[PDB]
Design a protein around this motif. Structure first.
Motif, PDB file in Angstrom:
ATOM      1  N   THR A 443      94.980   5.561  50.736  1.00  0.00           N
ATOM      2  CA  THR A 443      95.361   4.203  50.347  1.00  0.00           C
ATOM      3  C   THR A 443      94.110   3.426  49.959  1.00  0.00           C
ATOM      4  N   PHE A 444      93.905   3.249  48.657  1.00  0.00           N
ATOM      5  CA  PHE A 444      92.644   2.738  48.135  1.00  0.00           C
ATOM      6  C   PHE A 444      92.232   1.436  48.807  1.00  0.00           C
ATOM      7  N   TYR A 445      90.962   1.369  49.194  1.00  0.00           N
ATOM      8  CA  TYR A 445      90.385   0.237  49.922  1.00  0.00           C
ATOM      9  C   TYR A 445      89.914  -0.854  48.963  1.00  0.00           C
ATOM     10  N   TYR A 446      90.679  -1.938  48.864  1.00  0.00           N
ATOM     11  CA  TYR A 446      90.215  -3.133  48.172  1.00  0.00           C
ATOM     12  C   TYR A 446      89.138  -3.854  48.978  1.00  0.00           C
ATOM     13  N   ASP A 447      88.419  -4.761  48.308  1.00  0.00           N
ATOM     14  CA  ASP A 447      87.634  -5.775  49.007  1.00  0.00           C
ATOM     15  C   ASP A 447      87.830  -7.141  48.367  1.00  0.00           C
ATOM     16  N   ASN A 485     103.337  -1.973  32.652  1.00  0.00           N
ATOM     17  CA  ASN A 485     103.736  -1.015  33.667  1.00  0.00           C
ATOM     18  C   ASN A 485     102.564  -0.633  34.574  1.00  0.00           C
ATOM     19  N   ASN A 486     102.892   0.109  35.633  1.00  0.00           N
ATOM     20  CA  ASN A 486     101.967   1.016  36.305  1.00  0.00           C
ATOM     21  C   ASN A 486     100.771   0.380  37.004  1.00  0.00           C
ATOM     22  N   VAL A 487     100.657  -0.943  36.994  1.00  0.00           N
ATOM     23  CA  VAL A 487      99.689  -1.584  37.872  1.00  0.00           C
ATOM     24  C   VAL A 487     100.124  -1.412  39.324  1.00  0.00           C
ATOM     25  N   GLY A 488      99.146  -1.346  40.222  1.00  0.00           N
ATOM     26  CA  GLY A 488      99.361  -0.855  41.571  1.00  0.00           C
ATOM     27  C   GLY A 488     100.110  -1.780  42.512  1.00  0.00           C
ATOM     28  N   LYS A 489     101.262  -2.292  42.071  1.00  0.00           N
ATOM     29  CA  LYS A 489     102.021  -3.257  42.861  1.00  0.00           C
ATOM     30  C   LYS A 489     102.203  -2.811  44.306  1.00  0.00           C
ATOM     31  N   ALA A 490     102.784  -1.631  44.513  1.00  0.00           N
ATOM     32  CA  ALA A 490     103.023  -1.170  45.875  1.00  0.00           C
ATOM     33  C   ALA A 490     101.720  -0.975  46.631  1.00  0.00           C
ATOM     34  N   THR A 491     100.690  -0.497  45.938  1.00  0.00           N
ATOM     35  CA  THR A 491      99.421  -0.233  46.595  1.00  0.00           C
ATOM     36  C   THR A 491      98.874  -1.485  47.252  1.00  0.00           C
ATOM     37  N   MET A 492      98.999  -2.627  46.580  1.00  0.00           N
ATOM     38  CA  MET A 492      98.531  -3.878  47.158  1.00  0.00           C
ATOM     39  C   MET A 492      99.230  -4.175  48.472  1.00  0.00           C
ATOM     40  N   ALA A 548     110.893  -1.982  46.305  1.00  0.00           N
ATOM     41  CA  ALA A 548     110.426  -1.470  45.022  1.00  0.00           C
ATOM     42  C   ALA A 548     111.493  -1.522  43.936  1.00  0.00           C
ATOM     43  N   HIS A 549     111.131  -2.100  42.789  1.00  0.00           N
ATOM     44  CA  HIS A 549     111.983  -2.140  41.599  1.00  0.00           C
ATOM     45  C   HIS A 549     113.280  -2.919  41.808  1.00  0.00           C
ATOM     46  N   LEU A 550     113.145  -4.153  42.283  1.00  0.00           N
ATOM     47  CA  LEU A 550     114.292  -5.050  42.364  1.00  0.00           C
ATOM     48  C   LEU A 550     114.986  -5.193  41.012  1.00  0.00           C
ATOM     49  N   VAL A 596     109.098  -6.456  40.585  1.00  0.00           N
ATOM     50  CA  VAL A 596     109.933  -6.537  39.395  1.00  0.00           C
ATOM     51  C   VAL A 596     109.088  -6.121  38.201  1.00  0.00           C
ATOM     52  N   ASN A 597     109.754  -5.816  37.100  1.00  0.00           N
ATOM     53  CA  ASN A 597     109.092  -5.291  35.920  1.00  0.00           C
ATOM     54  C   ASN A 597     109.191  -6.198  34.707  1.00  0.00           C
ATOM     55  N   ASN A 598     110.236  -7.016  34.606  1.00  0.00           N
ATOM     56  CA  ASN A 598     110.357  -7.983  33.515  1.00  0.00           C
ATOM     57  C   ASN A 598     110.840  -9.302  34.109  1.00  0.00           C
ATOM     58  N   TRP A 630      85.812   5.021  43.842  1.00  0.00           N
ATOM     59  CA  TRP A 630      86.736   5.644  44.782  1.00  0.00           C
ATOM     60  C   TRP A 630      87.153   7.048  44.367  1.00  0.00           C
ATOM     61  N   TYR A 631      87.846   7.183  43.242  1.00  0.00           N
ATOM     62  CA  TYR A 631      88.392   8.491  42.909  1.00  0.00           C
ATOM     63  C   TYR A 631      87.348   9.516  42.511  1.00  0.00           C
ATOM     64  N   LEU A 632      86.100   9.127  42.315  1.00  0.00           N
ATOM     65  CA  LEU A 632      85.047  10.113  42.149  1.00  0.00           C
ATOM     66  C   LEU A 632      84.298  10.402  43.446  1.00  0.00           C
ATOM     67  N   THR A 666      94.626   1.681  32.608  1.00  0.00           N
ATOM     68  CA  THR A 666      95.131   1.292  33.916  1.00  0.00           C
ATOM     69  C   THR A 666      94.629   2.250  34.984  1.00  0.00           C
ATOM     70  N   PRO A 667      94.763   1.885  36.265  1.00  0.00           N
ATOM     71  CA  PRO A 667      94.243   2.763  37.325  1.00  0.00           C
ATOM     72  C   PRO A 667      94.837   4.153  37.306  1.00  0.00           C
ATOM     73  N   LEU A 668      96.125   4.267  37.000  1.00  0.00           N
ATOM     74  CA  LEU A 668      96.755   5.578  36.959  1.00  0.00           C
ATOM     75  C   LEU A 668      96.148   6.466  35.889  1.00  0.00           C
TER      76      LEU A 668
ATOM     77  N   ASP C  81     104.799   8.638  30.657  1.00  0.00           N
ATOM     78  CA  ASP C  81     104.129   7.401  31.049  1.00  0.00           C
ATOM     79  C   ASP C  81     103.503   7.476  32.436  1.00  0.00           C
ATOM     80  N   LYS C  82     103.996   8.338  33.313  1.00  0.00           N
ATOM     81  CA  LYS C  82     103.337   8.556  34.592  1.00  0.00           C
ATOM     82  C   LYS C  82     102.277   9.648  34.546  1.00  0.00           C
ATOM     83  N   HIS C  83     101.930  10.135  33.359  1.00  0.00           N
ATOM     84  CA  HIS C  83     101.037  11.281  33.187  1.00  0.00           C
ATOM     85  C   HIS C  83     101.497  12.486  33.998  1.00  0.00           C
TER      86      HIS C  83
HETATM   87  N1  LIG Z   1      93.924   0.384  42.226  1.00  0.00           N
HETATM   88  C1  LIG Z   1      94.441   1.568  42.563  1.00  0.00           C
HETATM   89  N2  LIG Z   1      93.794   2.315  43.480  1.00  0.00           N
HETATM   90  C2  LIG Z   1      94.305   3.500  43.818  1.00  0.00           C
HETATM   91  N3  LIG Z   1      95.413   4.092  43.373  1.00  0.00           N
HETATM   92  C3  LIG Z   1      96.031   3.331  42.469  1.00  0.00           C
HETATM   93  C4  LIG Z   1      95.625   2.087  42.016  1.00  0.00           C
HETATM   94  N4  LIG Z   1      96.515   1.591  41.079  1.00  0.00           N
HETATM   95  C5  LIG Z   1      97.420   2.534  40.986  1.00  0.00           C
HETATM   96  N5  LIG Z   1      97.190   3.613  41.795  1.00  0.00           N
HETATM   97  C6  LIG Z   1      98.011   4.807  41.920  1.00  0.00           C
HETATM   98  O1  LIG Z   1      99.121   4.671  41.051  1.00  0.00           O
HETATM   99  C7  LIG Z   1     100.336   4.631  41.822  1.00  0.00           C
HETATM  100  C8  LIG Z   1     100.741   3.195  42.042  1.00  0.00           C
HETATM  101  O2  LIG Z   1     102.152   3.132  42.336  1.00  0.00           O
HETATM  102  P1  LIG Z   1     102.921   1.755  42.364  1.00  0.00           P
HETATM  103  O3  LIG Z   1     104.224   1.870  43.048  1.00  0.00           O
HETATM  104  O4  LIG Z   1     101.988   0.652  42.852  1.00  0.00           O
HETATM  105  O5  LIG Z   1     103.146   1.531  40.847  1.00  0.00           O
HETATM  106  P2  LIG Z   1     103.867   2.314  39.670  1.00  0.00           P
HETATM  107  O6  LIG Z   1     104.825   3.279  40.232  1.00  0.00           O
HETATM  108  O7  LIG Z   1     102.782   2.842  38.744  1.00  0.00           O
HETATM  109  O8  LIG Z   1     104.597   1.155  38.934  1.00  0.00           O
HETATM  110  P3  LIG Z   1     105.987   0.428  38.941  1.00  0.00           P
HETATM  111  O9  LIG Z   1     106.435   0.206  40.342  1.00  0.00           O
HETATM  112  O10 LIG Z   1     105.753  -0.847  38.140  1.00  0.00           O
HETATM  113  O11 LIG Z   1     106.904   1.353  38.152  1.00  0.00           O
HETATM  114  C9  LIG Z   1     100.005   5.426  43.075  1.00  0.00           C
HETATM  115  O12 LIG Z   1     100.100   6.820  42.817  1.00  0.00           O
HETATM  116  C10 LIG Z   1      98.552   5.029  43.336  1.00  0.00           C
HETATM  117  O13 LIG Z   1      97.829   6.090  43.944  1.00  0.00           O
END
Ligand SMILES: Nc1ncnc2c1ncn2[C@@H]1O[C@H](COP(=O)(O)OP(=O)(O)OP(=O)(O)O)[C@@H](O)[C@H]1O
Ligand SMILES: Nc1ncnc2c1ncn2[C@@H]1O[C@H](COP(=O)(O)OP(=O)(O)OP(=O)(O)O)[C@@H](O)[C@H]1O
Ligand SMILES: Nc1ncnc2c1ncn2[C@@H]1O[C@H](COP(=O)(O)OP(=O)(O)OP(=O)(O)O)[C@@H](O)[C@H]1O
Ligand SMILES: Nc1ncnc2c1ncn2[C@@H]1O[C@H](COP(=O)(O)OP(=O)(O)O)[C@@H](O)[C@H]1O
Ligand SMILES: [Mg+2]
Ligand SMILES: [Mg+2]
Ligand SMILES: [Mg+2]
Lengths: 1030, 306, 309, 79
Positions: A443-447, A485-492, A548-550, A596-598, A630-632, A666-668, C81-83
């Motif tokens: 679970t990626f460590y923010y600061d 899309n795909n920004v780390g909503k759940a991760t936060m 997730a995904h209301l 949410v997405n839109n 982090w990922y490196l 994006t992070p993904l 889109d999820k690679h």
């Molecule tokens: N900042 C980040 N640090 C680490 N991992 C991240 C980061 N942003 C995204 N990820 C990765 O991408 C995914 C994030 O999933 P999350 O549920 O937050 O969003 P999503 O599935 O891409 O989008 P959505 O819910 O909008 O469809 C996880 O696999 C997580 O490891």
């Protein structure tokens, strides 16, 4: 191979020793200086890449015993000498010599050596002072060679290898900054006293959770297997004696409440973790919130005080996965296993962690236990991934009392009894990682220094907690939304939950067992939602519900509505509203956290009753730095992979290079790029393994293919949105544009880079307009922009906009131009604007559509207030008089830059050489000769024509030479042959470079003529002389 | 309604309903139209471009009707036409071959019978002479404010206003204005043809200030004393300075936080503008000759009996 | 599936005809319930992706997934889109040398026809150019059947009996019912004159007769010819004959088709026909009548000529 | 045929019928040696190629011509 280890008093430069026995099991008289390899056992995820060691034979060493210098590793022989390691004999002693080595040295000795003008005197000084000898010595990239003095600064590209000054440059660096005063290797300094260091009756030190797992095979003492299990403690220095009871002793001291006995060990000598500390597994610290200074004393006891507690009444914590039918069975079975497989002391007011792999799931296993022997499985296959807490709860003690800490469960005299549930709050992540200890999914460590939206949400949850810990219940809730899309909503939400020590439910809506199905079961779905949620809350600690995904279930009205569509819609809105608001009274302080997405698509009622709003963006470049970091990282690659050979980066990696080149991703995507790099490097590794070879110790990621993978990442982005790809045109593939490149860097580079010092003024130069005769690179500049910079490249090809129906503009130009705002920073490219935007005053019959396009284009383009989203529009034209007053110098498109006939003297040469990039020519016909032989008034792309038809006649020469050679072949062998067999049986490699010698240039100069004549140039030179009306 | 509402207890005439701006240049008053929102506190809703038009013949009037519905719903707002020229040219026998009926829908609802919307009509357009008498009338939209080039000291005034560069209550001269404010030379050595030209000129001079600052900054240290010359009696290969990057990328690893500065021109690392850097671009200030548009203006100004 | 594959160790899952279990619902135009909402197909897919992903991060070796489908873009783009993807092997076609060995295998497949008189299939490829492996199966069986009655004796293939089959059997499975007529002039049928055919040939065949030579020189592939056309004659023959090089995928366009007086005439024609040229493997494309198509408007005339130009 | 105009559920009904028909067509060739199959269609385009590939032959039957018609009238007017 296993080997026994010992540390010598250290010359550092002095060799290790090879034992006679290993010099018999791998004896070789041709190579008495047997170069060994050793793996050093350590704390950490795995054994760091082993060391090649130069060694001397010794017959005195006992069986499999080996000796290495101490201070070569900065440790001293006063510290506990580790008794074992692992050894590898180097196959045929095959090692490469290093291509380069650099050393760092203090300015005094640096100057004292540089005072010697004869370099060989310093080379002998390497021998006289450091006893270095070439080919004997192996050296290592960064090792400090003497405290305050010599150090190796790098080995490159290899981390290790042989040296000879006949090839090794021996680069030296001056420590002007005196950092060698701090960069001393000595891991121990002698304390002023051992008495008066506290008092043996009472010490106080900060406890810490051990940053890594540790295991019974690494520890120096020899605990039993069945008893003595699980619970251990680790100490750092002569502290081991300040307690009066050594390593291997028990102690029990706690800051509050009951005592907690633990076995205390000295740390292994090779340890990186900070001293003046007492380290523990999570098991201990879980019982002791805060209070990090722990009371410590001898506190010894005579073995186990209680031999039996005849029944125990354990309880599980509440928590997300602890209350589901599909886990119940695996939970109980792993509980049974864990408690059955070993004997332990336990106590009331204590927690037991249990870990298992949630993948095991809906596999029962029929026969492994209860009807089968005690040792049952290799967890190597029966993995782990998820973790649970059981509270020890009450136990039936005998007549003996108060000393409850020794309760223990004989597997036949005692049983364990469920009491349904208990409530307790998990540790704060800030003091201790669980995940990094168990190696689970990360679970990626923010600061909070650099992620504003995290600082936001963390403060919201922090206040919702602490305000209701005080007397004031908060109904705090928040919705997260994003433009991409795909920004780390759940991760936060997850990170925050751990960072604050807050419980959560994790639920996704997509997996609900029915859709928005026509026949009404919104009851069924919202019922299942609440019924799944509620179960833990009767014993929940302060907690959040994350949904997730209301957007999947809160559909919104009006596309075409059935009556039931209305009923479903309103029913859903109503029941969700009730559910949420009811929860706010059903339990205090429990926070709804949606996603949410839109945001346009969430229905208006829900959009009103919702509380806070947070917009999370695509990350900044400043953030990207930490993402790669982090990922490196070591742990973040090593987790995924089986083979014992570890992986690393080379310390050369430019984090600036990645962060700039990865812009807009994006992070993904950053994960995708890094993991692709890992793959490509491993493919290189196994390609290397085809020979006996070199560098077998470990593959590393390197800057080349890590750069390359960006291009694939950008194309896989482009095939998701904006399908067109672009052929590569690197910067040097153009030349002779000096002023123009000047202004383009003054527009797209310097104002885009360095906003830490560029004010980023309240308006910006919008674009670039290229104008002039055709064939002057004004198309090529755009493909170059698309190649070299990280910018994406949306475009429309001239009148790609106009379309059959009336109302043309919304059918294309609006959708695309706003799509460029929708995209991350990206150009729009235009060509032939003189065709797209006629000057409006030249009014047109037949619907006047030019007025419609031009009006919508200006409206979408200009003004750009609150809209400086990097939407650079750049483009080319033939003849600018036909451009509209769209060009009138508001700065909406009006960065006019001319291109034209080059300067006579050498810019044609710069052209020829640029187009000669990756061309080949290999004789005394220097390009100066060609550039002088060509007459002037030939221009631009006509010189590419001159190379084109020179190349054509060169390949014609080669083709007729082939025709001759194949004829002379067919006359003598292969009498019935033509093509495939011929080419597959020739093997040319001297000819195949097919270099033109000359003559093709001269006949190109004869055959080519200027493609635009001066009588054509005059028609452009007129508009040139208009200077667009100046 | 915010200053005269104690006066306008019941004005026996319906209050004036709108304003069309026009200019012979690109309408700099588009910025004005965007600004009057925050300058007055009203909401803002915009007909950008031609966007009323549609493919489907049934949709055009449904679209503009729903536009005026939105406006009359958002009772305190400004309704803006981004380029009235786009949609309201002179009536004729389908000079727009289809859906021109939108102009009649507008004429019907610009005041109609309801008169005072409380909303007002706002619009801008260059070349408004294509609009017609059928639509400009004092009982309809009329006020026809002209914009012209900022002659003489108005150049200075607009220059001073931009170079004040005050926002966010922070870095309150965000452009580092010239210490003497010696604008009285620069503003008329420059021939001014718009305002956006003057703004671009000043912005580009700021960029040049950054250039002289950024190019001097490192060399200004290097001239009194070089750095990182890690000489080692190099031999075999001429890496003597080619090594410099692979050195620097490892030799430096410091980190700092909460950094401060003071010798910059009143903002962090910023470079002051200077009068020479503007004056050198007096010839870079490029005209776009079109003064015949003033004779095009001479039409409506002849319709003006004054 | 996931659980079993997790227990059986290193494993590969095959999914075939993915469109039924995970395809997008025809990517329908217009978005009712499709703008901000998903069909159930994606709702399956995302569940699968998540579960396998939480496996995949435990062990890179444990599981892999193989999708077989029609065309990489046509599947649900969520799979991109999820690679999730990382590859694109497309079985583009059979080719000249292999197809003979393949055809021999079919001939010897079953009900053994015991080959043929004299030939060895190489020339026999001549008409099979566009065919496909299942097509060569069907064609082989057809040849066998229509041998076995037209002689009362059995196994002898004859050149003419083979040839007469392809005149009409036309397996052409990707070609619908019928999409060809012109068959008049062969490449070696030099009506009119060779006078500069030298240069046409030199542009034509060399990329298929000296092939790797072009690769080692970074030219942009030199092409592009205008015939002088002064008599109002020639090209109609010459171009058709060059197309009957047959190593190409010819497509027909003629100038005075495109000058529709509707404003949009360039779009939906020129871009349509060049997307068609992308849909074919790259090929010659014909134009004519440039005196109509491309008058030198010179910034003087600026007409609708320029909006197509 | 299969078309955009119809429910994919019904289209999968068509798919099922097509496939089972093609299989039974071969299954007769497995269970019942020497079976032969004659199909008839009033418009060739409507059978998809998914079935048409399992022809061995097809015949266009035209309308008759003069010599045939002379024979056919003789039949109908024979006693
Ligand atoms: N900042 C980040 N640090 C680490 N991992 C991240 C980061 N942003 C995204 N990820 C990765 O991408 C995914 C994030 O999933 P999350 O549920 O937050 O969003 P999503 O599935 O891409 O989008 P959505 O819910 O909008 O469809 C996880 O696999 C997580 O490891
Ligand atoms: N450094 C260079 N300077 C000038 N021309 C170059 C350079 N490098 C390559 N070229 C040639 O210039 C061509 C592009 O020229 P340019 O874009 O001006 O003309 P065009 O694309 O034919 O026409 P148009 O600009 O009207 O679309 C390239 O295809 C190449 O042949
Ligand atoms: N009096 C003025 N005349 C012209 N431009 C001005 C004037 N005052 C300010 N500007 C400039 O106007 C720019 C904002 O664009 P604005 O829409 O107002 O004008 P425009 O682009 O010329 O008009 P149009 O929208 O009609 O094309 C700013 O850069 C500002 O410097
Ligand atoms: N070998 C030949 N020599 C001269 N004319 C020919 C030849 N073959 C065909 N033609 C004639 O040329 C015409 C075919 O089109 P073409 O020559 O291209 O004229 P256009 O340029 O008008 O299309 C027809 O009149 C055809 O009969
Ligand atoms: Mg997500
Ligand atoms: Mg060009
Ligand atoms: Mg304006």
């Amino acid at each position: 191979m296993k080997a026994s280890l010992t540390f010598s008093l250290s010359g550092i430069y002095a060799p290790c020793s090879i034992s006679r026995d290993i010099y018999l099991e791998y004896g070789d008289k041709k190579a008495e200086c047997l170069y060994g390899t050793i793996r050093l056992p350590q704390y950490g995820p795995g054994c760091t890449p082993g060391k090649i060691v130069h060694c001397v034979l010794d017959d005195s060493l006992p069986f499999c015993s080996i000796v290495v210098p101490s201070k070569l590793f900065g440790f001293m022989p006063t510290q506990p000498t580790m008794d074992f390691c692992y050894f590898e004999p180097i196959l045929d002693n095959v090692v490469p010599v290093l291509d380069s080595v650099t050393f760092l040295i203090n300015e005094q000795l640096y100057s004292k050596l540089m005072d010697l003008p004869q370099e060989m005197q310093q080379i002998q000084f390497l021998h006289y002072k450091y006893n270095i000898n070439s080919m004997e010595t192996v050296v290592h990239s960064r090792d400090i060679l003497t405290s305050g003095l010599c150090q190796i600064l790098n080995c490159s590209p290899f981390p290790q290898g042989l040296v000879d000054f006949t090839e090794t440059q021996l680069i030296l660096v001056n420590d002007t900054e005196q950092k060698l005063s701090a960069l001393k290797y000595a891991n121990e300094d002698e304390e002023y006293a051992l008495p008066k260091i506290g008092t043996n009756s009472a010490l106080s030190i900060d406890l810490e959770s051990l940053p890594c797992t540790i295991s019974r095979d690494l520890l120096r003492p020899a605990p039993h297997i069945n008893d003595d299990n699980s619970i251990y403690a680790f100490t750092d220095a002569e502290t081991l004696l300040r307690l009066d009871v050594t390593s291997g002793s028990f102690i029990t001291v706690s800051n509050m409440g009951c005592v907690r006995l633990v076995k205390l060990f000295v740390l292994l000598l090779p340890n990186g973790f900070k001293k003046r500390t007492i380290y523990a597994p999570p098991k201990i610290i879980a019982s002791f919130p805060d209070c990090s200074v722990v009371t410590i004393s001898k506190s010894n006891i005579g073995h186990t005080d209680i031999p039996i507690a005849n029944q125990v009444f354990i309880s599980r914590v509440g928590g997300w996965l602890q209350s589901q039918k599909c886990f119940q069975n695996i939970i109980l079975t792993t509980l049974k296993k864990f408690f059955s497989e070993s004997k332990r002391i336990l106590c009331q007011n204590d927690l037991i962690p249990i870990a298992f792999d949630s993948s095991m799931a809906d596999l029962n296993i029929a026969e492994e236990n209860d009807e089968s022997d005690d040792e049952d499985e290799l967890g190597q296959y029966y993995k782990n991934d998820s973790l649970v807490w059981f509270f020890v709860t009450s136990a039936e003690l005998d007549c003996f009392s108060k000393d409850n800490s020794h309760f223990i469960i004989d597997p036949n005299r005692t049983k364990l009894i469920t009491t349904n549930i208990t409530n307790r709050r998990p540790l704060p992540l800030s003091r201790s990682n669980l995940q990094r200890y168990y190696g689970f999914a990360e679970t990626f460590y923010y600061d909070l220094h650099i992620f504003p939206y995290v600082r936001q949400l963390v403060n919201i949850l922090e206040t919702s907690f602490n305000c209701s810990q005080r007397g004031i219940t908060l109904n705090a809730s928040v919705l997260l939304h994003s433009t991409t899309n795909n920004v780390g909503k759940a991760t936060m939400v997850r990170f925050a939950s751990k960072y604050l020590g807050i419980h959560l439910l994790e639920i996704d809506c997509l997996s609900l067992t029915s859709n928005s199905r026509q026949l009404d079961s919104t009851s069924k779905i919202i019922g299942y939602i609440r019924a799944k949620c509620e179960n833990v809350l009767p014993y929940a600690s302060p907690a959040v519900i994350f949904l997730a995904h209301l957007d999947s279930i809160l559909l919104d009205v009006n596309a075409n509505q059935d009556p039931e569509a209305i009923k479903l819609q309103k029913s859903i809105n109503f029941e969700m509203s009730k559910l949420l608001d009811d929860f706010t009274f059903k339990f205090p302080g429990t926070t709804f956290v949606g996603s949410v997405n839109n945001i346009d698509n969430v229905p208006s009622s829900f959009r009103s009753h919702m509380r806070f709003e947070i917009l999370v963006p695509v990350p900044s470049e400043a953030q990207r730095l930490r993402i790669f970091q982090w990922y490196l990282s070591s742990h973040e690659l090593n987790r995924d992979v089986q083979q014992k050979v570890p992986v690393s980066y080379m310390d050369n990696i430019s984090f600036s290079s990645l962060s700039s080149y990865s812009a807009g991703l994006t992070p993904l995507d950053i994960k995708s790029i890094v993991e692709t790099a890992r793959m490509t490097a491993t493919a290189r590794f196994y390609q290397e393994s085809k020979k006996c070879g070199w560098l077998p110790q470990s593959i590393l990621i390197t800057q080349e293919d890590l750069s390359k993978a960006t291009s694939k990442a950008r194309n896989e982005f482009s095939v998701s949105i904006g399908a067109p790809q672009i052929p590569n045109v690197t910067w040097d593939d153009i030349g002779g544009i000096d002023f123009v490149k000047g202004e383009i860097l003054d527009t797209i580079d310097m104002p885009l880079k360095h906003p830490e010092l560029f004010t980023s003024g309240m308006k910006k130069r919008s674009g670039i307009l290229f104008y002039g005769p055709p064939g002057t690179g004004k198309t090529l500049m755009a493909k170059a922009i698309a190649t070299n910079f990280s910018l994406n490249f949306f475009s429309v090809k001239g009148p790609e906009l106009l379309n059959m129906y009336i109302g043309e503009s919304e059918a294309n130009v609006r959708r695309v131009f706003q799509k460029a705002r929708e995209a991350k920073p990206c150009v729009i490219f235009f060509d032939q604007i003189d065709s797209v935007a006629p000057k409006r005053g030249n009014q047109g019959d037949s619907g006047g559509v030019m007025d419609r396009i031009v009006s919508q284009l200006l409206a979408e383009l200009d003004g750009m207030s609150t809209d400086a989203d990097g939407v650079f529009v750049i483009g080319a034209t033939n003849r600018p008089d036909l451009l509209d007053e769209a060009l009138l110098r508001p700065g909406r498109f009006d960065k006019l830059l001319y291109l034209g006939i080059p300067d006579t003297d050498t810019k044609q040469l710069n052209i020829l050489e640029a187009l000669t990039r990756k061309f080949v020519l290999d004789n005394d016909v220097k390009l100066i000769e060609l550039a002088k032989l060509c007459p002037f008034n030939y221009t631009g792309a006509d010189f590419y024509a001159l190379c084109s038809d020179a190349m054509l006649n060169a390949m014609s020469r080669i083709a007729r030479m082939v025709e001759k050679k194949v004829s002379q072949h067919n006359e003598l062998t292969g009498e019935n042959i033509s093509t495939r067999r011929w080419f597959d049986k020739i093997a040319t490699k001297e000819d195949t470079k097919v270099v033109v010698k000359m003559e093709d240039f001269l006949k190109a100069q004869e055959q080519l003529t200027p493609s635009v004549s001066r009588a054509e140039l005059n028609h452009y030179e007129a508009v040139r002389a208009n200077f667009e009306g100046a | 309604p915010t200053k005269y509402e104690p006066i306008f207890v019941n004005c026996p005439l319906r209050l004036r309903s709108g304003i069309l701006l026009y200019g012979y240049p690109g309408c700099g008053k588009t910025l004005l139209a965007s600004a009057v929102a925050q300058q007055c506190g009203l909401n803002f809703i915009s007909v950008k471009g031609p966007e009323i038009l549609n493919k489907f013949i049934g949709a055009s009037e449904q679209n503009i009707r729903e536009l005026f519905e939105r406006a009359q719903s958002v009772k305190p707002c400004i309704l803006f036409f981004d380029e009235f020229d786009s949609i309201a040219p002179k009536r004729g026998h389908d000079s727009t071959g289809v859906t021109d009926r939108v102009v009649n829908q507008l004429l019907t609802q610009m005041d109609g019978a309801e008169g005072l919307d409380g909303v007002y009509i706002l619009a801008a357009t260059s070349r408004p002479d294509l609009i017609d008498s059928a639509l400009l009338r004092p009982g309809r939209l009329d006020k026809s404010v002209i914009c012209n080039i900022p002659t003489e000291s108005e150049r200075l005034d607009i220059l001073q206003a931009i170079v004040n560069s005050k926002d966010k209550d922070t870095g309150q001269k965000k452009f580092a204005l010239e210490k003497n404010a010696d604008l009285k030379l620069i503003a008329e050595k420059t021939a001014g043809f718009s305002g956006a030209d003057l703004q671009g000129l000043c912005y580009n001079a700021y960029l040049k200030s950054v250039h002289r600052w950024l190019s001097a900054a490192d060399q200004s240290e290097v001239v009194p004393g070089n750095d990182n010359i890690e000489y080692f009696s190099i031999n075999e290969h001429g890496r003597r300075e080619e090594n410099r990057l692979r050195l620097k990328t490892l030799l430096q690893q410091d980190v700092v936080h909460e950094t401060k500065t003071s010798t910059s021109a009143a903002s962090e690392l910023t470079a002051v503008v200077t009068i020479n850097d503007l004056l050198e671009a007096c010839q870079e200030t490029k005209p776009s000759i079109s003064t015949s548009e003033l004779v095009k203006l001479r039409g409506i100004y002849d319709r003006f009996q004054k | 599936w996931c659980s079993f594959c997790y227990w059986y160790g290193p494993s590969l899952i095959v999914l075939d005809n993915v469109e039924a279990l995970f395809g997008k619902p025809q990517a329908n135009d217009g978005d009712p319930s499709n703008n901000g909402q998903w069909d159930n197909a994606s709702k399956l897919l995302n569940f699968f992706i998540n579960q396998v992903t939480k496996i995949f991060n435990k062990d890179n070796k444990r599981i892999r997934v193989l999708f077989s489908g029609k065309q990489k873009t046509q599947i649900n783009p969520l799979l991109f889109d999820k690679h999730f993807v990382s590859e694109t092997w497309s079985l583009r076609a059979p080719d000249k040398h292999a197809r003979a060995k393949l055809l021999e295998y079919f001939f010897s497949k079953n009900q053994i026809m015991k080959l043929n008189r004299d030939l060895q299939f190489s020339d026999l490829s001549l008409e099979t150019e566009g065919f496909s492996p299942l097509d060569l199966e069907i064609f082989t069986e057809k040849i066998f059947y229509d041998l076995q009655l037209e002689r009362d004796c059995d196994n002898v293939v004859t050149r003419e009996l083979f040839s007469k089959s392809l005149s009409a059997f036309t397996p052409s499975a990707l070609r619908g019912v019928k999409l060809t007529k012109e068959t008049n002039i062969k490449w070696g049928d030099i009506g009119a004159l060779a006078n500069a055919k030298d240069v046409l040939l030199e542009t034509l065949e060399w990329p298929t007769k000296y092939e790797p030579i072009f690769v080692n020189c970074p030219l942009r592939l030199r092409s592009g010819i205008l015939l002088y056309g002064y008599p109002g004659c020639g090209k109609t023959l010459l171009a058709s004959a060059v197309a009957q090089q047959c190593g190409l995928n010819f497509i027909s366009v003629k100038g005075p088709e495109i000058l529709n007086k509707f404003i949009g005439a360039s779009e939906q024609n020129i871009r349509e026909l060049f997307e068609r040229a992308q849909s074919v493997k790259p090929c010659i494309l014909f134009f004519d009548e440039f005196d109509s198509i491309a008058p030198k408007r010179g910034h003087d005339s600026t007409g609708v000529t320029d909006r197509v130009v």
